[PDB]
């Protein structure tokens, strides 16, 4: 019979197979259901399809096509809920989100 | 000498949501390490869920309960609404 990749049937972009192995190898539980990978690739594929579209819309505003960490650091700290998910993470080459306390500004 | 990664996938998604933009290496190896972080929190969460309830195995539900704890706020109501939409399509297509 003809081979249809399991990532196709789910319609996902991330690979469901490669996850379905990683759940076994990482020793997360003694058995892994067939529903977990398909469900776990979607969530990943959703999030990774979130930071990017945000990063992209940050790239266009700096008049650069390509995404670079400085764009990512801007896409994550601006958003309020992504920042809360990655609260502890420190992005390499990331730079900081521009912020000056109002008391310091001259007058 | 192969170190498998998500460099193909993240790049494929990027064309779906920005058919023009392309991503640079040092920015990819972030995403390639962001996923490997989330996928190690979610799974690492639905490993304690199954253990607590004494269920031996890890199934999808145990992932919903794993997502609705980590992903904060509006993501939780969008991820699980994006997860089920996948798994429902899968079983019905098998």
């Amino acid at each position: 019979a003809k081979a249809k990749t399991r990532s196709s049937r789910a319609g996902l972009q991330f690979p469901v197979g490669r996850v379905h192995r990683l759940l076994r190898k990482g020793n997360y539980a003694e058995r892994v259901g067939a529903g977990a990978p398909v469900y776990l690739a979607a969530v990943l594929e959703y999030l990774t399809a979130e930071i990017l579209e945000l990063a992209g819309n940050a790239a266009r505003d700096n008049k650069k096509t390509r995404i670079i960490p400085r764009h990512l650091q801007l896409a994550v700290r601006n958003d309020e809920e992504l920042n809360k998910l990655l609260g502890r993470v420190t992005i390499a080459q990331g730079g900081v989100l521009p912020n000056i306390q109002s008391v310091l500004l001259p007058k | 000498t192969r170190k498998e990664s998500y460099a193909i996938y993240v790049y494929k998604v990027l064309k779906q949501v920005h058919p023009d933009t392309g991503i640079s290496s040092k920015a990819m190896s972030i995403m390639n390490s962001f996923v490997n972080d989330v996928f190690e929190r979610i799974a690492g969460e639905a490993s304690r869920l199954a253990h607590y309830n004494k269920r031996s195995t890890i199934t999808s539900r145990e992932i919903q309960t794993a997502v609705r704890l980590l992903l904060p706020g509006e993501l939780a109501k969008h991820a699980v609404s994006e997860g089920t939409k996948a798994v429902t399509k899968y079983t019905s297509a098998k």
Partner: peptide, 18 residues
């Protein structure tokens, strides 16, 4: 102002591109 994201849209738009 020379470097700006301007924060176009923040609230989620669930995969209209699907």
């Amino acid at each position: 102002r020379r470097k700006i994201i301007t924060s176009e849209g923040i609230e989620r738009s669930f995969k209209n591109e699907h």
